[PDB]
Amino acid sequence: GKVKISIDPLTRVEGHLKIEVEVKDGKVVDAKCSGGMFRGFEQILRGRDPRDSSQIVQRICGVCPTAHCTASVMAQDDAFGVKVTTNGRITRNLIFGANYLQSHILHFYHLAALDYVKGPDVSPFVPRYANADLLTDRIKDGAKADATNTYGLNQYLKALEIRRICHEMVAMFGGRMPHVQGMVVGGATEIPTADKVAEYAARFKEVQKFVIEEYLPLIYTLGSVYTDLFETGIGWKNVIAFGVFPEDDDYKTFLLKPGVYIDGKDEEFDSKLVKEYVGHSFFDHSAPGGLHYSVGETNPNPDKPGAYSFVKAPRYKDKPCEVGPLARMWVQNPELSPVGQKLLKELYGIEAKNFRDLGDKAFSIMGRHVARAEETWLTAVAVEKWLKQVQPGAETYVKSEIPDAAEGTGFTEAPRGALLHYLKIKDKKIENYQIVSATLWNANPRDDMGQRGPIEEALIGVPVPDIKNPVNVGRLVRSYDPXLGCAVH
């Protein structure tokens, strides 16, 4: 009694994604995730001036280019042997932090919300699934349904301007956005002035107000209507984080700390244990067993028998692990926003102080949205602090020279999850460049041992009571905020 559903394009994610599920007895029983577009940045980068990489890699993705830029300039800093100044570190955090706010807001509203909110009856809001299980369908009190839907839709519309203001903030010290100019090996290219710090701060306060007063309340309200969506889209419950936003000059402390949580147990993150498999990916490896990124290879092969995706399959100690706000928030376990503490009590009867107090509810469709909203607030608190720490006039740039032969790795967290760039230099040129990105960890295919990627696994058990309107499949996928440009590069 199995029925196959194939969704290509899976829209309202970044990039080219296909989702296939098998449904039996009203639930997903198998799944396949496929990235269908390849560019090969790791091949394109070879032979170039290593400094070019921090411009080239941003073109992996116009949603998260600051993450790639950050990873790249950190890899370069490492390879070139240069230490960034205090003000350079802070300035880089202000540039990147402004896009964390932009990316999460863009995601929840402009990618995720149309699975819950009924938009106006004009394209691109229509056509839509006939039985879409929206706020206007779920809430049986019609006035309340209309009011809640309008509340959500007005936030979607207002968020268009809020996200644009976030890009004014990125451009303040970043030059422009998408694709900043302001981060380079050795630091940042423009020293913050008192006037421009104040200008950033004024815009930031408007964004922060939206986050606290509109976004957080909408998310908790949404979850209180869709309580069933805290109980599905579970997956492996393994997460990894690399550390993001260094809070001191020796990169020992972060806003959100590195760590791994596998099979109910916390451990430290050890980069030696990352490897990529390609058994079901359109790539050839010179040796079996999966490859650590420091010896990674990018040899595309769309004819490879048995392969179904351009996404490689990263594993940590041979375990699939997911990444993103859920991962970071689980690993760090920060205190919840005052809004979250209040609304969890008021709307759900839940007493919660710290993220882990959500328990099983964290590992779900709605848990991923909650994690992302909470992290937006947490990042705003941090940006507010960094705006006080940044010193007008203090040097942000330190000179360097391209080394003959070197290696460097930049570790960070993109808004969608753990990110590293590995750079090897020979004869002052890029010899190898390997990118292990966020959505790569989430939207990967099966590894050589048949273990499903995190999105594939989280789809198992998702309810599909209406095969013609399989809304929970897209809801699960979009809860991960996938970026297939990043996943494949």
């Binding site: 269908g36 001036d49 938009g119």
Partner: protein
């Protein structure tokens, strides 16, 4: 009165052209979507998915045949029979599945369009996906049209990404022309098919640092005063109005902040590299 119908397709893109469009002001994106264009298909933001999204796209391309703008973001990879970019799957009348390549999609939709607008350096000129080292046979819209012998009005709006003013301005000018061609002639294009309205000015000739350049006052590092030429600035060989318009609602621009990397030019990136070595 009537809005311009748009089908926006993505090949080997990064979604940055779309994100830059979302940053529009005067008009802002809400007004663009509700008042200026009918964005009929756009994979990043549209409500429908899969079969429904594609069926809607093809329905619009039929109903509005010769009367919609085909917007293309990203390059078109031609190696391996187009299999480096699969844009969707079509379910025939018997249940069988067929993947659609970017090549197939553009070959299908371009002849149905009123005009094709290649937004971004990738679609206009090949850009980063078509740069040295790529193995995907990545191609621009103009080169694909030439190979396919497709004669369809084509306007290029390059930049990596383009400024939203360039994309909005070009689309509005094109639509105005269609509505009244003698009152609103098409914008004059240069030899690379991009509007002189936005790409006629040389950055360097219009640069506020030109006085410093003339006096040989060059910034020793990014955070020192002077012209940016020694830091790698490609303003001298780049044609765009960034010096006047600036970026992100006038907040900053590449040259003030750092250097111009020549992102609008047909030889970006290879002819503009290394980025931090002077021209």
């Amino acid at each position: 009165a009537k809005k311009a119908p748009v089908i926006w397709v993505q090949g080997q893109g990064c979604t940055g052209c779309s994100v830059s469009l979302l940053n529009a002001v005067h008009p802002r994106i809400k007004e663009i979507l509700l008042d200026v264009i009918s964005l009929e298909f756009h994979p990043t933001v549209m409500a429908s998915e899969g079969e429904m999204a594609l069926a809607h796209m093809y329905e619009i391309a039929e109903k509005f045949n010769g009367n919609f703008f085909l917007l293309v973001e990203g390059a078109i990879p031609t190696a391996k029979e187009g299999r480096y970019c699969i844009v969707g799957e079509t379910l025939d009348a018997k249940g069988h599945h067929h993947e659609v390549t970017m090549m197939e999609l553009i070959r299908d939709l371009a002849p149905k369009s009123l005009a094709t607008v290649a937004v971004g350096t990738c679609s206009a000129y090949g850009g980063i996906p078509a740069a040295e080292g790529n193995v995907t046979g990545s191609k621009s819209v103009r080169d694909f049209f030439a190979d396919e012998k497709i004669e369809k009005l084509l306007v290029n709006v390059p930049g990596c990404p383009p400024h939203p003013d360039w994309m909005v301005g070009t689309l509005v000018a094109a639509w105005s022309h269609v509505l009244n061609p003698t009152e609103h002639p098409l914008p004059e294009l240069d030899d690379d098919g991009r509007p002189l309205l936005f790409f006629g000015d040389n950055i360097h000739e219009n640069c506020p640092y030109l006085d410093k350049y003339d006096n040989s006052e060059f910034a020793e590092t990014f955070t020192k005063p002077g012209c940016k030429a020694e830091l790698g600035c490609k303003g001298p060989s780049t044609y765009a109005d960034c010096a006047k318009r600036r970026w992100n609602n006038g907040i900053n621009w590449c040259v003030e902040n750092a250097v111009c990397i020549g992102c609008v030019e047909p030889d970006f990136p290879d002819g503009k590299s290394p980025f931090y070595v002077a021209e």
